[PDB]
């Protein structure tokens, strides 16, 4: 019985490979050989957000593209005002081992989580004026590596227990649990329509889930090592993943396989964070090599470098209006680039 | 300029002031330690003498605070969450010296910690626990360490090794062989920026806190000397 199931799974894998090979009519690099390169994309540090006393582990922008939240090893969840560098808030954290932070699309709530296996929702629009823990979400059996607000009521969190969970914040219960990853899920990215989200785990695979149905639509493979970052394309029909094999790869949801790979011989340091520009033409990747490289998502040629961080770049985000790029680092400094 | 802008700037300055107050208040004369080990080791009882899944242990020795973090709520896969402990002053690695079957697993874990990209700067305070049980096992002799390590047959006790007054030579040779097994990995690829501090601790040892204090003092002194080009 077990052998029959294994053989049928192997033949299903072969059939999927054959279908993908049939769909592979051409390649993104071959098709985009006609279009001109974007040229030397050079940005400069327009703001250096000082105020973190330890390594910055994560950040998240606001939908207003002005307020951004950052999390650090010092145990502070500072909401910044990038326009004027003013610190709007500074939230003390119960655990200093936070690995992720999320800022709600409405801006009323901010979330964080980490090695404490708990996603903590903080109210920013409280009538008393002092931010307090609105809700603590428990149920993950591993470190919470990423979280993203669906809305004021729903949040999606990925954990080191190989599962992604959808939460109902007002009740504090797991509305939906997503299973299928065999490694620590390291990051998740929400689609523009919020009906789908991808996750990148330590099994070198990325899976697309259905938020409403709790089922996995596709599995994307090709990466060689643990995937550290993931980010949907602005179109919503593709995403890019950064892994420990020092390679970024772009996958297409409808084509069900990767389109282009972003790697070089001299690049031997893994990617810690990936993000797309507003048009999706630029893929920004943060590496362990203290630097970030601006890739040409349609041509896989490094169009620029965001040199300027003194330690490992841990987080990287682009505003919803595409006006700026913020990169945090282990040197306790968060920089705004433009 | 405007009233809202002035209020925002004053709030930012107040937040920065409170933030700077918190920073030094909690970071001066306090040190963070990562407690690593296996299930069989007495990691939870090393400095327990006067002690969300991260058992935090706080102890004081000489007006210096030590925050010892024990991660115990994750899966056995640890290549990812261990990078959060880059900035700890030392890693407290506990080994069950009596269990030879898992001692190679402990050696592999020590090697991975030693050679990790984000842990190659942290100095490991090795604690070879269960010394009494190791002594009893070697004295009984039913289980032979040569089966798990054939190169123990050619091993001889180091000249400067300091056995206990009532300690048997066979026990001394076995325990120092295990310590040398760890120290070989420590010195094979060590860049000189971090060091291993082996200690023969027991289940009833009440001086592990002082040992950690002295080792951290030595680690910080060596870091200061390296920073001042004195070492």
């Amino acid at each position, epitope marked *: 019985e077990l052998d029959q199931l294994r053989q049928e799974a192997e033949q299903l894998k072969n059939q999927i490979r054959d279908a993908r090979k049939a769909c592979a009519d051409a390649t993104l690099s071959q098709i985009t050989n006609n279009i001109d390169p974007v040229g030397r994309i050079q940005m400069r540090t327009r703001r250096t957000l000082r105020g973190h006393l330890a390594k910055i582990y994560a950040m998240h922008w606001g939908t207003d593209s002005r307020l951004l939240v950052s999390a650090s090893q010092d145990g502070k969840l500072i909401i910044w005002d990038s326009y004027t560098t003013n610190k709007v808030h500074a939230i003390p954290l119960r655990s200093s081992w936070v690995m992720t932070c999320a800022y709600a699309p409405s801006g009323n709530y901010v979330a964080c989580g980490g090695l404490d296996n708990i996603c903590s929702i903080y109210n920013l629009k409280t009538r008393e004026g002092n931010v307090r823990v609105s809700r603590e979400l428990a149920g993950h059996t591993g470190y919470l590596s990423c979280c993203r607000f669906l809305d004021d009521n729903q949040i999606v969190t990925s954990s080191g227990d*190989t599962t992604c969970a959808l939460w109902d914040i007002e009740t504090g219960q797991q509305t939906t649990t997503f299973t299928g990853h*065999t*490694g620590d899920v390291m990051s998740l990215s929400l689609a523009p329509d919020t009906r789908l989200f991808v996750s990148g785990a*330590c*099994d*070198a*695979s990325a899976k697309l889930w259905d938020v409403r149905e709790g089922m996995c639509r596709q599995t994307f*493979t*090709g990466h*060689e*090592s*643990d995937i550290n970052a993931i980010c949907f394309f602005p179109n919503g029909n593709a995403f890019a993943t950064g892994s*420990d*094999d*020092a390679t970024c790869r772009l996958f297409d949801l409808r084509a069900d396989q990767e389109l282009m790979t972003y790697s070089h011989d001299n690049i*031997i340091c*893994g990617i810690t964070s990936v993000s797309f520009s507003k048009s999706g033409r630029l893929l920004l990747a943060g590496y362990d090599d203290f630097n970030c490289n601006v890739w040409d998502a349609l041509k896989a040629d490094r169009a620029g470098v965001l040199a300027g961080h003194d330690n490992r770049v841990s987080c990287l985000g682009v505003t919803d209006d595409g006006m700026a790029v913020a990169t945090g680092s282990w040197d306790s400094f968060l920089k705004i680039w433009n | 300029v405007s009233a809202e802008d002035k209020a925002a700037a004053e709030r930012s300055k107040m937040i920065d002031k409170n933030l700077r107050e918190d920073g030094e208040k909690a970071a001066a004369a306090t040190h963070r330690l990562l407690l690593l080990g296996a299930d069989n080791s007495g990691k939870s009882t090393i400095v327990k003498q006067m002690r969300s899944g991260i058992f935090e242990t706080k102890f004081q020795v000489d007006k210096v605070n030590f925050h010892m973090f024990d991660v115990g709520a994750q*899966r*056995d*896969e*640890r*290549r990812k969450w*261990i990078q959060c402990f880059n900035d700890v002053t030392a890693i407290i690695f506990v080994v069950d010296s009596s269990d030879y079957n898992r001692l*190679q*697993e402990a050696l*592999n874990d020590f*090697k*991975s*910690i*030693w*050679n*990790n*990209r984000w842990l190659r700067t942290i100095s490991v305070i090795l604690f070879l626990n269960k010394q009494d049980l190791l002594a009893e096992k070697v004295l009984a002799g039913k289980s032979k360490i040569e*089966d*798990y*390590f*054939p*190169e123990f047959a050619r091993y001889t006790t180091p000249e400067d090794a300091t056995p206990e007054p009532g300690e048997d030579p066979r026990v001394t040779r076995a325990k120092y062989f295990i310590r040398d097994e760890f120290l070989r990995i420590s010195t094979a*690829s060590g860049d000189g920026r971090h060091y291993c501090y082996p200690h023969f601790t027991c289940s009833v040892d009440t001086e592990n806190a002082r040992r950690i204090f002295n080792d951290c003092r030595d680690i910080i002194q060596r870091m200061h000397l390296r920073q001042y080009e004195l070492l």
Partner: nanobody
Amino acid sequence: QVQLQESGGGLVQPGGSLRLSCAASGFTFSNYKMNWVRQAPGKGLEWVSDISQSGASISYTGSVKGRFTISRDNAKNTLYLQMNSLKPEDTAVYYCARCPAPFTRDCFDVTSTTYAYRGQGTQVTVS
């Protein structure tokens, strides 16, 4: 897809010889360290041998020292374990395991229960 297919191994008399072979796919064999991990019946996973990227540095478990010989063929993307003078204590399922990251000399979760970069494994029985 990162795939590691193990071939060879089976029934053998004590003192015999078996040569396990592992075929790598989906990754560059030369950039990663390779291990051999075995799981005796009723026992957890145990790390048997090791080999670096080039193969100059080879490590062994003390029990299998002088009997097993780990061989790496970078051109053929194959990892071998020349097992000599087998004994009944060697009966286990043998997994070729790939270290998680390239260009690194540390291998953290190779012996994990659900490590992603092992193979299905081959049963080796000594009798």
